[PDB]
Design a protein around this nucleic acid. Structure first.
Ligand SMILES: O=c1ccn([C@@H]2O[C@H](COP(=O)(O)OP(=O)(O)OP(=O)(O)O)[C@@H](O)[C@H]2O)c(=O)[nH]1
Lengths: 266, 157, 357, 139, 139
RNA sequence: UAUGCAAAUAUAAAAUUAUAGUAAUUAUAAAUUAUAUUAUAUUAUAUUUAUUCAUAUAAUUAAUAGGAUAAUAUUUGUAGUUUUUGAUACCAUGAUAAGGAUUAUAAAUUGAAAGUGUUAAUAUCAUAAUCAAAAUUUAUUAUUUAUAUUAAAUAUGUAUGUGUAGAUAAAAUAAGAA
């Protein structure tokens, strides 16, 4: 007479460490020696449990657009799902894709640390979406299905502690996590510069600076996501000499050295 | 799960956490949704830069983006149910079964005041309390005085 | 009352009870507290220092005239936190073609140190011929008396560690206290690079010598990176050096040994791709590191696991055991009496009861 | 314990409800067309005079007083406005020569009394209007 | 007696008075109220310039919806395409098997009758049937 | 409804019952318990107003993890599946409400403790929970009455019928009542 919610589970560490680590006893929690979390669930069970997290607009809900069942029984009356092709005839198709959900970094602060519009709150710290792998948040692969268990939902297993941790976030929590996990200093000692995507912005700033458009140069500098090189700072500082803008030169130097890895220590 | 080794005495207490999460989602989406709504249905020209087709096409595109925003917090605050954090009892704001300052139901408030769990002072049941604004005009007067203290006090720049 | 607890700070009844301060009694501070002054903890950060250089510094400092003269050549050599991507053979050719021209031993040594640093960054193993061409004849050979500059020796050590060269011992032995005595000036980054290189190279005595020298010279084991220590301790197989590692592992702190165990486990498991060269299987060292971490860490209490197989005494649980041996107690008493001598020594005792099994 | 499924709706009720809803929708279409027709015809048709002939401004004989002004100045537009209370009041406001006398002193028949046709001569006419027309009390 | 999960959890507390336009469970029983003159200003968006709601469009890579939302406003393509249109309603669903051009531009909740006049004679009990007969709803 | 036929409590006694054999004593007393103002006298009660009362939906609750201007930890990116079982769709101890009839003028308040769904020991298939646009049959609820009538979250199409049966609600406090 044995009953179980889940009939199969998988371990976390593979067969290279546990065979040797089993000889060392582990002090499990005294009042619940056997634990079974979301990271310990099988693929199908975890997927079906994560689909049910969202109240609506999710795969778990029978009518949310992402369901997969052929038919649904409603009040002892069977009903057939209208396929996407038949819906398209009278429902106009508007779809941008994963790009629509994500929002720019400059708007992250206005959106209160969130760059994703997904109904599951994505946190950049590697502890809330903590599956077996560390929580890494993708940007151009954000989807409703969300194969990586990186979002936060309030219905899955072992979620209360994660909810409490999310609610106890400090000021600039997500912003600081994003900064420290995206702009980390290189191991070889070189500053995290020479980014291929960010390169044209530096040249534009340098051109505006050498053209004496310091206001527009700074207005484009505030759009920089990564850490700009020392060339930007030297040009911006040299722009202030003709105008005697010591206040702005000092502000530029402070923003360069005090915060961004002392790039302006030149 | 499925009431196997439940720790909290009440299952419904988790709905309080769910309500907090929906409030956080509202905090995220309150600016983007409002901006999209404002841009979409503004008939007058925005400025000299955008007029006519350059404005109507932009409005259509921003409305399409807002519709494509999956998970946007559309629901208003007054339609979100209020559930006590102590005993998971539901109360609707505006009635007497919910208090605004403590965010607990009428039953929880009565229990806490009858015991010692909340420092409150007793006033006459058929009076206006002791507040000067309540004696002066009542609920609406104190509401307006809160507004005046918050915003109208400042000569905004 | 109830399952939900009562917070005493918010509940006024607790705050106004006889075990706290009533509101009628004067409100004033009682027994002012000084915790941060009596015993102030050092600042230990869970996150590593973000602004750390995270590399070996060469202390490049030459005469300004020579520096500006060699500026066209030095642009290709690495600067402070700036690494040009010039090919290493180009700078090697420039050095081998221009070094005889400039007449300054210190300047030549600094230039060669920069060349070694650049070729180490590029992992170009062909530069040892430069050392044999210039330094080997006078700095370390048949009892060489010269005193090499600290910058040059540090750069050479960094290069040999990066290229996993086998010639590092001939220089380290000179850098011991009886020779040049440059060990105390080595950075923790230098020590970590040495340990990682030796662990990859699989030298049994090199790791022991380096660890003993670090302990002697007071190198900061805690600030030495965990991965380098793990790689260095993975390569020990001989019994003597293994015993040395066992007795030396107590020098590290509790947090350091815990994270050493964590890094070892993750690296030999999931983080096998983190290393460019996969780590060899050393189950003895893995088990000993785990066991040592368990010893050092505080021990929790798991009563069910500890006493799962616990069985009470025969006399204690006789009433609750249907088939238990009671004549064993009489046999033990008889044996005790015979040992005492009160009973005859080695007297034949027959079974007092039937055997029910 | 051990819950069991209990039917709530009748076995054949669903299809019957569906067809009843369809028939109700068709009947609503018919009634909507009829109500639109009746509302347009009521708006176009001439209604009774909305001013009380028993009060100070509208008391003089038809050959004197404000009636001369109405007959010789604004008579043409009254037929075009079909004697509805809102347009006649607005025209009285715009014509001037009366000032605030149309509100401070004048009075008008109630909302349901001013919607009677041109010739009624009976009080109970307002209850003779069609009931199946969903024109919201607009004949 | 309505049968739902929230019926046990919550309590009606008699005929309690709620704040204006703030009842907890909205039940728009007046959606199908007909009004010809106010046809475009009843249970519909106030401004003609407003776009159709998000519920009228498909946003993501959907696989299919069993029924469309009530606020989805009927358009020409709904009838022209000849596809399948369903709206969730008591007891189960209402399907638009009679596509008409007279309901273009109106919301499906306005088109569908919430409080159906039809009464099931099957699930009704003896006492409940007696009560309905006494009220006159049943013979 | 006394004329006959008819000794009969006003007591010389030996624990109850019983034919003077049946069972194991038998009776009795006191205190207390909700039915009865009296007619100057610790209060004049007696007037005004009101009554077509309705709403609830689409299932997963059991961890801690710190970042710039800090003398250095990649702890960048912290990775050991699986032996338990109740507030859940019954039941699973206790606890707050409504309900005016005699301590009164006076430097004073006209709302009660006798208990009202949610709360702290009994277990033994229980995933019933709002994040919108939704389904009157249910005792416990003051709605706008005939000059001008639908613009912003979507917000009531029904019942004109001599102020009209029965039954019933409220007030003697800045009000006006003897
Ligand atoms: O502490 C750490 C963490 C991570 N890594 C990562 O190791 C990668 C290379 O893998 P290895 O670290 O095994 O190579 P290596 O010995 O040549 O490395 P260096 O001493 O030259 O750094 C590098 O690209 C780096 O990101 C470290 O080197 N050290």
């Amino acid at each position: 007479s044995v009953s179980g919610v889940f009939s199969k589970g998988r371990g976390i560490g593979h067969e290279a460490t546990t065979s040797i680590l089993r000889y060392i006893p582990r002090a499990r929690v005294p009042w619940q020696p056997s634990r079974f979390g979301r990271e310990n669930l099988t693929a199908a069970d975890m997927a079906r449990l994560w689909s049910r997290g969202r109240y609506r607009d999710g795969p778990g809900n029978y009518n949310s657009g992402y369901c997969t069942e052929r038919t649904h029984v409603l009040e002892e009356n069977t009903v057939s799902i209208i396929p996407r092709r038949e819906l398209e005839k009278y429902m106009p198709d508007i779809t941008i894709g994963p790009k629509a959900l994500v929002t720019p970094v400059s708007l992250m602060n206005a959106r209160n640390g969130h760059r994703v519009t997904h109904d599951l709150l994505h946190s950049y710290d590697p502890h809330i979406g903590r599956l077996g792998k560390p929580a890494v948040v993708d940007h151009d692969n954000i989807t409703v299905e969300d194969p990586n268990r990186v979002g936060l939902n309030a219905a899955t297993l072992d979620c209360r502690g994660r909810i409490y941790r999310w609610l106890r976030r400090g000021p600039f929590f997500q912003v600081d996590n994003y900064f420290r996990r995206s702009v980390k200093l290189n191991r070889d000692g070189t500053l995290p510069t020479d980014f291929v995507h960010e390169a044209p912005l530096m040249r534009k700033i340098i051109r505006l600076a050498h053209r004496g458009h310091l206001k527009a140069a700074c207005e484009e500098y505030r759009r920089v996501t990564t850490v700009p090189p020392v060339e930007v700072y030297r040009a911006l500082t040299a722009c202030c000499v003709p105008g005697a803008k010591l206040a702005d030169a000092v502000s530029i130097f402070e923003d360069g050295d005090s915060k961004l890895f002392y790039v302006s220590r030149d | 799960m499925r009431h196997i080794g439940q720790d909290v005495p009440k299952r419904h207490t988790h709905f309080v956490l769910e309500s907090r999460l929906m409030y956080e989602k509202s905090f995220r989406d309150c600016w983007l949704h409002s901006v999209c709504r404002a841009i979409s249905q503004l008939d007058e020209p925005l400025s000299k830069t955008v007029v006519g087709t350059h404005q109507k096409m932009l409005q259509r595109k921003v409305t399409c983006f807002q519709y494509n925003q999956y998970g946007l917090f559309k629901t208003p605050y007054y339609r979100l149910a209020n559930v006590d954090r102590y005993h998971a009892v539901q109360g609707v704001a505006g009635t007497r079964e919910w208090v605004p300052y403590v965010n607990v139901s009428y039953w929880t408030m009565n229990k806490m005041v009858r015991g010692g769990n909340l420092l409150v002072h007793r006033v006459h049941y058929t009076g206006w309390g002791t507040d000067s604004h309540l004696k002066k005009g009542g609920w609406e007067h104190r509401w307006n005085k809160v507004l005046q203290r918050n915003v109208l006090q400042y000569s905004r720049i | 009352v109830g399952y939900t607890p009562v917070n005493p700070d918010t509940s006024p009844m607790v705050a106004y009870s006889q075990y706290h301060w009533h509101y009628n009694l004067p409100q004033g501070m009682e027994r002012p507290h000084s915790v941060n002054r009596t015993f102030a903890a050092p600042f230990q950060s869970n996150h590593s220092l973000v602004n750390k250089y995270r590399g070996v510094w060469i202390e490049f400092d030459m005469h300004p005239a020579f520096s500006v003269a060699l500026e066209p050549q030095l642009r290709k050599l690495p600067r402070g936190r700036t690494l040009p991507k010039t090919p290493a053979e180009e700078v090697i050719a420039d050095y081998t073609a221009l070094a005889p021209l400039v007449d300054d031993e210190k300047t030549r040594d600094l230039w060669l140190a920069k060349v070694f640093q650049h070729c180490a960054f590029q992992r170009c193993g062909g530069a040892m011929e430069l050392w044999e061409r210039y330094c080997h004849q006078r700095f370390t050979a048949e009892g060489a008396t010269a005193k090499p500059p600290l910058s040059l020796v540090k750069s050479v050590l960094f290069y040999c560690n990066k290229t996993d060269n086998s010639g590092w011992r001939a220089l380290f032995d000179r850098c011991l206290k009886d020779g040049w005595n440059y060990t105390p000036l080595f950075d923790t980054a230098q020590w970590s690079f040495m340990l990682k290189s030796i662990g990859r190279m699989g030298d049994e005595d090199g790791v022991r010598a380096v660890l003993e020298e670090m302990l002697d010279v007071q190198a900061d084991l805690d600030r030495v990176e965990a991965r380098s220590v793990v790689i260095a301790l993975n390569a020990v197989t001989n019994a003597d050096v293994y015993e040395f590692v066992k007795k030396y592992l107590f020098n590290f702190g509790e947090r350091k040994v815990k994270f050493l165990r964590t890094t070892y486990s993750d690296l030999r498991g999931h983080g096998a791709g983190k290393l460019r060269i996969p780590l060899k299987e050393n189950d003895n060292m893995y088990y000993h590191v785990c066991w040592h971490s368990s010893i050092r860490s505080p021990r929790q209490f798991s009563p069910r696991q500890l006493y799962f197989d616990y069985t009470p005494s025969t006399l204690g649980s006789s009433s609750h055991n249907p088939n238990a041996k009671i004549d064993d107690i009489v046999k033990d008493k008889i044996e005790k009496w015979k040992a005492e001598g009160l009973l005859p020594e080695d007297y034949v005792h027959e079974d007092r009861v039937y055997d029910r099994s | 314990a051990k819950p069991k499924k209990r039917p709530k709706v009748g076995q054949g009720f669903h299809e019957k409800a569906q067809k009843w809803r369809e028939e109700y929708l068709l009947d609503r279409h018919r009634a909507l067309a009829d109500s639109l027709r009746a509302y347009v015809e009521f708006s176009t048709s001439k209604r009774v005079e909305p001013w009380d002939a028993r009060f100070k401004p509208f008391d003089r004989i038809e050959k004197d007083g404000v009636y001369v002004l109405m007959r010789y100045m604004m008579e043409e537009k009254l037929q075009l406005c079909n004697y509805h209370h809102r347009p006649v009041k607005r025209l009285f406001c715009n014509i001037g020569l009366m000032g605030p006398q149309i509100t401070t002193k004048a009075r008008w028949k109630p909302y349901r009394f001013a919607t009677n046709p041109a010739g009624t001569s009976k009080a109970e006419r307002m209850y003779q209007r069609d009931k199946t027309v969903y024109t919201h009390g607009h004949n | 007696i309505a049968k739902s999960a929230f019926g046990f959890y919550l309590a009606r507390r008699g005929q309690r008075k709620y704040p204006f336009l703030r009842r907890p469970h909205i039940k728009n029983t007046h959606s199908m109220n007909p009004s010809a003159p106010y046809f475009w200003s009843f249970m519909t968006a106030k401004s003609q310039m407003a776009f159709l709601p998000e519920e009228n469009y498909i946003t993501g890579d959907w696989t299919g919806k069993f029924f469309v939302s009530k606020r989805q406003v009927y358009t020409l393509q709904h009838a022209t395409s000849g596809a399948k249109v369903r709206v969730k309603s008591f007891p189960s669903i209402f399907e638009f098997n009679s596509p008409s051009r007279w309901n273009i531009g109106k919301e499906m909740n306005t088109l569908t009758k919430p409080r159906m006049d039809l009464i099931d004679e099957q699930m009704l009990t003896k006492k409940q049937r007696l009560d309905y007969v006494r009220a006159g709803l049943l013979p």
